[PDB]
Amino acid sequence: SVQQQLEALEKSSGGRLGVALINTADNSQILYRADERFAMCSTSKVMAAAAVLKQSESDKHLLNQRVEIKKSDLVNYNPIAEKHVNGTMTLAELGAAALQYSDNTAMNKLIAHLGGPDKVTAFARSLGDETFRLDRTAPTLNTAIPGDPRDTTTPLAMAQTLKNLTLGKALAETQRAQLVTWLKGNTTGSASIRAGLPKSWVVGDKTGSGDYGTTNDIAVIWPENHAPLVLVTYFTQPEQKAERRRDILAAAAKIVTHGF
Numbered sequence: 001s002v003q004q005q006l007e008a009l010e011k012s013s014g015g016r017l018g019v020a021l022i023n024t025a026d027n028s029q030i031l032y033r034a035d036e037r038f039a040m041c042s043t044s045k046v047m048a049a050a051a052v053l054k055q056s057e058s059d060k061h062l063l064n065q066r067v068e069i070k071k072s073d074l075v076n077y078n079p080i081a082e083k084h085v086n087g088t089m090t091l092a093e094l095g096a097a098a099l100q101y102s103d104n105t106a107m108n109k110l111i112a113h114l115g116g117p118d119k120v121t122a123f124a125r126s127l128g129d130e131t132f133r134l135d136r137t138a139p140t141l142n143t144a145i146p147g148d149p150r151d152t153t154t155p156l157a158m159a160q161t162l163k164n165l166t167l168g169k170a171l172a173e174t175q176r177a178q179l180v181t182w183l184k185g186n187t188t189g190s191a192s193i194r195a196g197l198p199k200s201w202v203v204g205d206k207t208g209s210g211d212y213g214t215t216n217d218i219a220v221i222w223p224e225n226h227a228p229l230v231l232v233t234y235f236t237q238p239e240q241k242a243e244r245r246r247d248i249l250a251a252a253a254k255i256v257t258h259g260f
């Protein structure tokens with residue numbers, strides 16, 4: 001069975017696997033440690049970007065508002081922001097960079113505008129997500145220390161919220177479409193969930209990487225002849241310097257999407 005397959009995958013993986021798939025055709029779900037907390041790492045950027053999109057609903061000039069990028073803003077990974085030092089990036093461009101290239105500086109600019117990590121949590125709560133919590137900025141929000149509650153959520157919680165954000169009631173249509181466009185254009189998830197699905201399927205996703213070999217990916221999947229699927233695959237390991245295992249995410253995705 002699917003459950004036995006996931007258990008077998010986890011057993012040989014040397015880590016802890018968290019999976020939550022929602023089939024929007026009948027709202028049925030495939031869950032594996034779906035109620036356990038996992039460090040979200042960069043997958044948390046979706047909530048920060050969505051928070052700004054929500055604001056843009058009542059501020060028509062927000063997305064085009066320029067933000068100055070200084071050398072001091074650069075952190076551990078910022079392939080897009082680095083290209084704009086001494087210049088500016090609009091909030092929309094920061095949203096794009098944060099989601100499609102997982103630019104950590106872009107994420108920090110989004111948090112800074114919103115007023116801090118706690119403001120992202122407040123946004124998640126307003127969506128009915130009582131699990132999500134953002135406590136730090138990038139890159140420390142990716143320490144993924146075992147048992148640390150900071151910057152964590154559960155696979156089911158994130159799956160429900162991602163569904164609400166991309167296919168549901170969370171955002172106004174234009175903003176919802178914008179978030180979807182950003183997710184579909186992600187460049188960082190080839191080897192993750194996407195690697196375990198038919199090549200013709202359209203996918204939007206946000207990956208995450210951190211210490212303890214934490215390897216995450218959250219996605220919305222559009223089959224060619226079926227209703228969308230929302231999938232969260234989180235993976236973490238016992239040693240701080242473990243390698244990321246995107247192959248495990250691809251494997252989990254293949255397992256739970258069999259038949260769709």
Ligand SMILES: *C(=O)[C@@H](NC(=O)/C(=N\OC)c1csc(N)n1)[C@@H]1N=C(C(=O)O)C(=C)CS1
Pocket residue numbers: 040041042043076077101102104139140141142143188206207208209210211
């Ligand atoms: C998000 O998860 C973030 N990850 C990091 O910045 C870190 N490691 O990534 C290799 C990190 C920060 S502190 C620490 N011990 N480790 C970005 N996300 C991705 C992704 O997988 O989507 C990146 C490719 C780049 S940085």
